[PDB]
Amino acid sequence: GLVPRGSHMSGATEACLPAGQRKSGMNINFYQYSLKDSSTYSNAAYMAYGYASKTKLGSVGGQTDISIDYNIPCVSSSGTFPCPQEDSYGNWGCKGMGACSNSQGIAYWSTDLFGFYTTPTNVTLEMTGYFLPPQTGSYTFSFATVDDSAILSVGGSIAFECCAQEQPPITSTNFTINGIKPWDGSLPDNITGTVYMYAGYYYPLKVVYSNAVSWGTLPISVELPDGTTVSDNFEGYVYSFDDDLSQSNCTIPDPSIH
Ligand SMILES: [Cl-]
Ligand SMILES: [Cl-]
Ligand SMILES: [Gd]
Ligand SMILES: [Gd]
Ligand SMILES: [Gd]
Ligand SMILES: [Gd]
Ligand SMILES: [Gd]
Ligand SMILES: [Gd]
Ligand SMILES: [Gd]
Ligand SMILES: [Gd]
Ligand SMILES: [Gd]
Ligand SMILES: [Gd]
Ligand SMILES: [Gd]
């Protein structure tokens, strides 16, 4: 009577209440990933944590604008311009630019991914932060498409451990969205994963994304309990906290009864 009974079979997603100074945005770490390696990123262990065993290239913090949309250059008669993938044709040209003289299959350097100078043709990145629901209820995260391989995980001990955002990745493969590139071809669009969330709790959020060749795409959305959709720009929803491994009360295993 007096209190709610709590989610059945302790099924609530673990959340956190970090006591430190909140910073807007997610942290992005970048790791080496080999041009044309179409197999490493097809393994769950790699996408959950193995990526951090490869050389770390760099990081940028405070990112609220998180969708990925990387276009290779077309070296054309009029200069070098990024080619939207749907405008690529033949062997090859880019609509409105004529024939492109450069290879689709080499590494290209760009600051497209969050202003960090790297090779978006071949890289793995890890986005970490906390999602703050403004409303209690069911949230549906989605990737509109995945080019090449990606996962999204939400929850304490699933994305990472509360108040330990900056630690080496945890080994959980219980993904909220599994957008891992299948060994055999495959992979529909609008892959989705739902999480029930309680307003005002901070939910660890990890996205791991990888590309082996040319174009890279990962359009990230969330549908709120109120049926509206937030896409690309998660300002106001995603935050970072410096690690505090000594904050004893930081983990809230069951927000339904806290
Ligand atoms: Cl370009
Ligand atoms: Cl053309
Ligand atoms: Gd964007
Ligand atoms: Gd932007
Ligand atoms: Gd972009
Ligand atoms: Gd960009
Ligand atoms: Gd851009
Ligand atoms: Gd952009
Ligand atoms: Gd844990
Ligand atoms: Gd690609
Ligand atoms: Gd809906
Ligand atoms: Gd944009
Ligand atoms: Gd730190």
UniProtKB/Swiss-Prot annotation:
Biotechnology: For many industrial applications in which the yeast S.cerevisiae is used, e.g. beer, wine and alcohol production, appropriate flocculation behavior is one of the most important characteristics of a good production strain. The ability of yeast cells to flocculate is of considerable importance, as it provides an effective, environment-friendly, simple and cost-free way to separate yeast cells from the fermentation product at the end of fermentation.
Subcellular location: Secreted, Cell wall; Membrane
Disulfide bonds: none
Description of post-translational modifications: Extensively O-glycosylated.
Tree of life domain: Eukaryota
Family stated for the protein in its record: Belongs to the flocculin family.
Function as written in the Swiss-Prot or TrEMBL entry: Cell wall protein that participates directly in adhesive cell-cell interactions during yeast flocculation, a reversible, asexual and Ca(2+)-dependent process in which cells adhere to form aggregates (flocs) consisting of thousands of cells. The lectin-like protein sticks out of the cell wall of flocculent cells and selectively binds mannose residues in the cell walls of adjacent cells. Activity is inhibited by mannose, but not by glucose, maltose, sucrose or galactose.
Name recorded for this polypeptide: Flocculation protein FLO5
Source species: Saccharomyces cerevisiae (strain ATCC 204508 / S288c) (Baker's yeast)
Gene of this entry: FLO5
